Homo-oligomer: A and B are copies of this chain.
């Protein structure tokens, strides 16, 4: 006779958990996460910003890389998120306890973050993480300014209701670099058509493809670097093959159209 199943941990490919040293993207922007999960540190004269933290177990590694960059826990002022799933917002709660950082997010992302990713529209309770509270709610197109760097939120609902692209302008070799940290556009295992928990899912994804295509985008980065053709382990050529935002959006739309057709057939 038969017990209920044990809880199953959210396990991921080893490369998603492989620590890397900070990799410079532009004068003040660094990848400080793992080989296969993005966590961006932007350093200003008035404190640092973190965009995503990856998986829950990455908090100490992130703090190590911040220290290596000259950023103490008191100096981390702000955490921004692409979206509030365990593999991108995992360590936010612990980061808030261990640093000065406050979280800014849209209402959708704040609600999901506050329930630790539980009751996910598509994953249920299978992919949860420690809950965290947002300190500031942001609206579409709202700006947040830290030490003179202006971050603009561009909502791009689909992968989660609260999915957001964050854009800012850094410098490199003396010239401006418009960085676009565009969120995921995948729909892994999702029911796309007639989903009662997300009735306008398709319309939202389509609008989001268009939003991504039009972002100010000298350099695209994505929460999973492979989605934008980054290779964080490739050193001086890590970003050489990166997609434009236009190409990223088009590829995501072609994949989505294929998934729709397969869902209709399945």
Contact = CB atoms under 8 A, between A and B. Distances in A.
B200 A139 contact: yes
B197 A139 contact: yes
Interface in A182-197: 196-197
26 contacts: A3-B17, A3-B18, A3-B34, A4-B17, A4-B57, A6-B9, A6-B12, A7-B9, A7-B56, A7-B57, A47-B74, A56-B125, A77-B100, A93-B115, A97-B135, A100-B100, A111-B111, A114-B131, A115-B130, A116-B116, A116-B118, A116-B131, A121-B139, A128-B128, A139-B200, A140-B200
Given A8-B9, A107-B162, A130-B116, A94 B135 contact: no
B197 A97 contact: no
Interface of A: 1, 3-12, 14-15, 17-19, 34, 46-47, 55-58, 61, 74, 77, 93-94, 96-97, 100, 102, 107-108, 110-111, 114-116, 118-119, 121, 125, 128, 130-131, 133, 135-137, 139-143, 161-162, 196-200
CB-CB nearest 7 A-B residue pairs? A141-B199, A118-B130, A9-B9, A3-B17, A4-B17, A107-B107, A7-B9
Contact of A74 (B8, B19, B46, B61): B46
Contacts of A128: 116, 128, 130
A10 B7 contact: yes
A142 B17 contact: no
A118 B137 contact: no
